[PDB]
């Protein structure tokens, strides 16, 4: 339980300081190993250079093929996978094009039917990829 | 609760509800006093002085028929012991255990008991050097 004494204070304090290390919602904030691990440095986005297009399978209950992109990160020289999140826009990504990369949804667990991938490609060459998809802009090769 | 180890007992001695002396005790303060000091010269502790008195002379309590109890009497006449009753007894029991254990080092029980008795004596010691009744350099050994 707990201590109700007048001078009990210090025991209470030290108890909390111990038991917050059993919380993962404390660690995720205060500890900088988490920051380091994250490929953006904990920044909102980052840019990368497209390496290779990689076809990626899917898990057992929903059989599909998914289009993914092996990208390298300018900032930290790490490699990462990301998903193309529109229909038939694999075309609009080509090798050695700069590209932006974002997280998607829950960022501690991988998204369903794509293992290991929490990362979706928002922008190709700073153009909105959505804009290309539902036609407004056209991709520069300029 | 028992201080060390298990035990709950209610074995105890009460008090009289009459704190004034009986009608069949016509003895004065002085006679009581004299009796105490007389007995004490045999080396009897206060615990057995009270027993001798109550049983023979019908004394209700020493405190009821004199203005003071057994140690206060002794102190005032300079017969009082310098080692309190409760302390002395434990030390006797202690030493006797240590005899038995000197011979028998396979004895599990009396070993554990000696550990108890030790720390109990220490508690007493500590007490009586806060509330001065022993020298402040006293130690069990």
């Amino acid at each position: 339980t707990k201590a109700n004494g007048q001078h009990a204070a210090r025991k209470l304090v030290r108890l909390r300081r111990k038991n917050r290390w059993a919380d993962k919602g404390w660690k995720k904030s205060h500890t900088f190993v988490a920051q380091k691990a994250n490929p953006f440095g904990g920044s909102s986005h980052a840019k990368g250079i497209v390496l290779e297009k990689i076809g990626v399978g899917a898990k057992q209950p929903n059989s599909a093929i998914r289009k993914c992109v092996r990208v390298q990160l300018i900032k930290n020289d790490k490699k990462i996978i990301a998903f193309v999140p529109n229909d038939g826009c694999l075309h609009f990504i080509e090798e050695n094009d700069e590209v932006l990369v974002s997280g998607f949804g829950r960022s501690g667990h991988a998204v369903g039917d794509i293992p290991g991938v929490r990362f979706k490609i928002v922008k190709v060459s700073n153009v909105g990829l959505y804009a290309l998809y539902r036609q407004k802009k056209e991709k520069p090769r300029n | 609760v028992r201080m060390q180890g298990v035990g709950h007992g209610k074995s105890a001695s009460s008090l009289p509800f009459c704190r004034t002396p009986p009608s069949w005790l016509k003895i004065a303060s002085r006679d009581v006093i004299d009796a105490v000091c007389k007995l004490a010269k045999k080396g009897l502790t206060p615990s057995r002085i009270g027993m001798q008195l109550r049983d023979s002379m019908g004394i209700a309590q020493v405190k009821n028929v004199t203005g003071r109890k057994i140690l206060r009497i002794l102190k005032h006449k300079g017969m009082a012991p310098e080692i309190p009753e409760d302390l002395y007894c434990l030390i006797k029991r202690a030493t006797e255990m240590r005899k038995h254990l000197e011979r028998n080092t396979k004895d599990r029980d009396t070993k554990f008991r000696l550990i108890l008795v030790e720390s109990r004596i220490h508690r007493l010691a500590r007490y009586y050097k806060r509330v001065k009744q022993l020298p402040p350099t006293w130690k069990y050994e």
Binding site: N4, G5, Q6 | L15, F17, R19
Partner: protein
């Protein structure tokens, strides 16, 4: 042992009241326990009580009229103040209408209602409905 006299008394009263019993025994007595009872007997929640003398420590005995619903104890005796009457009165009581918190002051032992009136806060003591 018991580290609060009040706690020993008012867990006999509460239990007894939930069984509807019309008298209760109380093992110790203090100057404090008296005052607490006195309050509630004025406001109409207790018939009478006796203090009996063993010439060591007394044994209180109380007559319940069944008009109580709880008698609690606020154990650490936390500090309540002129603004903070409000706080306590909301949080530990089911009402502001008939909730009675009892407090200690230099002045004596009294209800929160009378405490406010004389404009002195103090350390809390116990409570009843």
């Amino acid at each position: 042992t018991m580290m609060s006299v009040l706690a020993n008394a008012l867990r006999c009263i509460a239990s007894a009241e939930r069984r509807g019993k019309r008298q209760v025994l109380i093992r110790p007595s203090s100057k404090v326990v008296v005052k607490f009872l006195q309050v509630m007997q004025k406001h109409g929640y207790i018939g009478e009580f006796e203090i009996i003398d063993d010439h060591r420590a007394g044994k209180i005995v109380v007559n319940l009229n069944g008009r109580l619903n709880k008698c609690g104890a606020i154990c650490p005796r936390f500090d309540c103040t002129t603004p903070d009457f409000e706080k306590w009165v909301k949080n530990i009581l089911p009402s502001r209408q008939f909730g009675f918190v009892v407090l200690t002051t230099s002045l004596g032992i009294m209800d929160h209602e009378e405490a406010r009136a004389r404009n002195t806060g103090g350390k809390v003591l116990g409570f009843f409905y």
